[PDB]
Amino acid sequence: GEIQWMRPSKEVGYPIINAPSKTKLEPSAFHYVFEGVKEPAVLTKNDPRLKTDFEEAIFSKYVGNKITEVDEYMKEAVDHYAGQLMSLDINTEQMCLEDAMYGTDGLEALDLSTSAGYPYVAMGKKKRDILNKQTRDTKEMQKLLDTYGINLPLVTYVKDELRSKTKVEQGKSRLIEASSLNDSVAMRMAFGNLYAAFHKNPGVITGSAVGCDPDLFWSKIPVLMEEKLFAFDYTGYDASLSPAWFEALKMVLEKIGFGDRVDYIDYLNHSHHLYKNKTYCVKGGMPSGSSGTSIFNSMINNLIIRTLLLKTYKGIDLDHLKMIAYGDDVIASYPHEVDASLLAQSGKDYGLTMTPADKSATFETVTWENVTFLKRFFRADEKYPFLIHPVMPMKEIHESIRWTKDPRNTQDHVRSLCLLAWHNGEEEYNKFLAKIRSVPIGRALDLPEYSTLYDRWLDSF
Ligand code: NA
């Protein structure tokens, strides 16, 4: 991705967009009970903690576009992935406005807490005022679609979240590029059934895990993998995507029956954004807050891995490439050992910056013992080995419990953390609960004991 130009929104007929300048994150009742070093991300250029220009830092993710056209290796990757998706018999029919708005099997209703984007954010009109779950009324939306149309500017917001001291000082805050409610709705009508098919089929056929439930899905992953695992991290995946990758995605959609609306992908590829009082045009780069962002990033990841394997290992049998992606995150396998370092070398030529899995200093062999997916390790249950525990290290959990964004949600926040933590074992889980109950706020919470969560886990299969 590359920013073509940027300048005052008034010069192109757009208004100044207001965005909060203060974080909602504040120390929680457990701030001094657990260890942690993360703090709220910088949200404004005048943050005292900054040690470099803010705006330059937040837009530096657009490293440019390395490739222009789709080459032979990419075309082969497209044919293979599309062929694989064809076995799913995905309903290519457009989804009706009602379901696209309020959900159906395999697709949750539109989130009412998220931004409605332009022009609603500038008119002070919110989602609450447009849709109603109890009625499932589409009349208001339809009128708004007819009035403002589609392909509207995406509104940029700085993401309010925790980050390492370094990322804070370097102004490396992540951004939310929110599609207008009109575009979100239009894209869900266009691809709603595709989204549902992926959500209902996490695995090695879709090569996707979006919509998955880790507590249950972890036991299914090992059986789908080939003998030798391989993986790697990407540096700024979304923003590094060149226009050619969007064209390859369109080719896949055409081959599976959605050639009808590949134009929606152009909206993602060549897009314009509003940030404060400026407007900018980007060539390439996947927007972070658009309908289908995670699914399309996942599909493209399937294309990327296939392309690099074909380019690096002529004669590779892609029918034995078994991979599962969640956006840029991926767990992959092949019957034979492959060199991730070599694949990373080939990736540079395609505009992708690939590094050792989980921040390793060097590319090491990936094993069931050290592999992670969505930050979770895989550990067989001591009593019933066929049941696989998704294990997220206590470090992330401790960092999280030390802050709050609304005291009213303390109970939900802590329970969510308990659902992740117990997989670390009874000894660790009990220590976690004891620390929580060392302060008044923690003692007033209703939290499940270990045996309760273990029994609930067994009963969920
Ligand atoms: Na873009």
The 10 Å Cβ neighbour count of residue 416 is 14
Strand 329-334 vs strand 39-40: parallel, antiparallel, or unpaired? unpaired
SS3 (DSSP) at 376: strand
d(CA 336, CA 340): 12
Looking at residue 382, what DSSP letter applies? S
CA of 186 to the centre of ligand 1 (A): 18
Instruction: Tell me the domain boundaries of the chain.
Output: 1-13+70-202+243-284, 213-242+292-367, 375-461
CA of 266 to the centre of ligand 1 (A): 8
Give the span between the Cα atoms of 327 and 312, in whole angstroms.
Answer: 23
Cis peptide before 119 (omega within 30 of 0): yes
List residues in the chain that are followed by a break over 2.5 Å (C to N). none
Element containing residue 403 per DSSP (H, E): strand 403-404
Q: How many CB atoms lie within 10 A of CB 52?
A: 11
Interval between CA 241 and ligand 1 midpoint (Å)? 9
* 3-state DSSP helix/strand/coil % of the chain, to nearest 5: 40, 15, 40
CA distance 90 to 421: 37
CATH node for 213-242+292-367: 3.30.70.270
Taking the centre of ligand 1 as the mean of its atom positions, its distance from the CA of residue 106, in whole angstroms, is 27
In angstroms, the CA 188 to CA 5 distance is 29
Quote the crossing angle between the two packed helices 181-200 and 293-312, to the nearest 10°: 60
CA 210 to centroid of ligand 1, rounded, Å: 21
Between the CA of 296 and the centroid of ligand 1 the distance, in Å, is 13
In this structure, which amino acid lies at residue 217?
A: F
Of the candidates 392, 403, 416, which has an alpha carbon nearest to the alpha carbon of residue 36? 403
Angle at 279 between CA 275 and CA 282, to 5 degrees: 100
The closest alpha carbon to 316, from 304, 327, 303, 307, belongs to 307
Binding-site entries for Mg(2+): 233, 328
| CA pair distance 101, 292, nearest whole angstrom | 14
Any long-range contacts for 54-59 (C-beta under 8 Å, 24+ apart)? 54/171, 54/173, 56/171, 57/170, 57/171, 57/172, 57/173, 58/158, 58/171, 58/172, 58/173, 58/175, 59/3
Cα 97 to Cα 320: distance, rounded to the nearest angstrom: 39
282 CA to centre of ligand 1 in angstroms:
5
Instruction: Decide: 191 and 67 in contact? Cβ < 8 Å.
Output: no
Resolution in A, one decimal?
Answer: 2.0
Ligand 1 centroid to Cα of residue 1, in Å, is: 6
Q: Could you tell me the end-to-end alpha-carbon distance of the chain, in angstroms, rounded to an integer?
A: 43
Distance, CA of 103 to chain centre: 20
- The C-alpha angle with vertex 375 and arms to 166 and 454, in degrees rounded to 5, equals 135
Q: Give the H or E element holding residue 83.
A: helix 72-86
Q: Rounded distance, CA 131 to CA 115, Å?
A: 13
Six-digit token pair at 166?
């370094």
- Ligand 1 geometric centre to CA of 132 (Å): 31
The three state secondary structure string of 243-307 is HHHHHHHHHHHHHHHHHHHCHHHHHHHEEEEEECCEEEEEECCCCCECCCHHHHHHHHHHHHHHH
DSSP 137-204: --HHHHHHHHHH-S-PPEEEEE---EE-HHHHHTT---EEEEPPHHHHHHHHHHHHHHHHHHHH-TBT
Q: What are phi and psi of 371, to 5 degrees?
A: -75, 145
The β-bridge partners of 185 are: none
Cα angle 45, 51, 55; round to 5? 35
**Residue 172 and residue 444: Cα distance in Å, rounded?**
37
**Helix, strand, or coil (residue 416):** helix
Binding-site members are: 233, 328
Q: Is 380 exposed, middle or buried (0-12, 13-18, 19+ CB in 10 A)?
A: middle
**Ligand 1 centroid, distance to 396 Cα (angstroms):** 31
Cα distance between residue 155 and residue 173, in whole Å = 16
Q: What CATH number should be reported for the domain whose range is 375-461?
A: 1.20.960.20
